[PDB]
Amino acid sequence: MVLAPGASIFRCRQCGQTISRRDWLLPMGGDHEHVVFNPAGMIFRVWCFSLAQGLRLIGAPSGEFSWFKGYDWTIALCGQCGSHLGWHYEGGSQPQTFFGLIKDRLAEGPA
Ligand SMILES: O=c1ccn([C@H]2C[C@H](O)[C@@H](CO)O2)c(=O)[nH]1
Numbered sequence: 001m002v003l004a005p006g007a008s009i010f011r012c013r014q015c016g017q018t019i020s021r022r023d024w025l026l027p028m029g030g031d032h033e034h035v036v037f038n039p040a041g042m043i044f045r046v047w048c049f050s051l052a053q054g055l056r057l058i059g060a061p062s063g064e065f066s067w068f069k070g071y072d073w074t075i076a077l078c079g080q081c082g083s084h085l086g087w088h089y090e091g092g093s094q095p096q097t098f099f100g101l102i103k104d105r106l107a108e109g110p111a
């Protein structure tokens, strides 16, 4: 529907690893963008994706402090460089699983 789009793929900002695509953004509670803080007070602009790749999911899930009701999280690192890119979420409903990735740790560009 658009020739030569420059904004279709998300890659790891620190190394280039393919991570997700704009077509895979997922509006959780009506918005694909959720702004949250961890217990250390860090603010994150979290983009929700249905699907992602090139990550490494660390350990087992935890429900503690989850920003998304009904889901447990696993830390998602870039599988190539180890940069912490976000979290994989599971154990919930409609959808069962998704990714919440930290927007400013990704780079957007052409396929
Ligand atoms: O939904 C989530 C996912 C992660 N964290 C925090 C917990 C932990 O301190 C750190 C792990 O990335 O992020 C949350 O607060 N909520």
Ligand SMILES: [Zn+2]
Pocket (backbone or CB within 6 Å): 012, 013, 014, 015, 016, 017, 078, 079, 080, 081, 082, 083
């Ligand atoms: Zn990386």
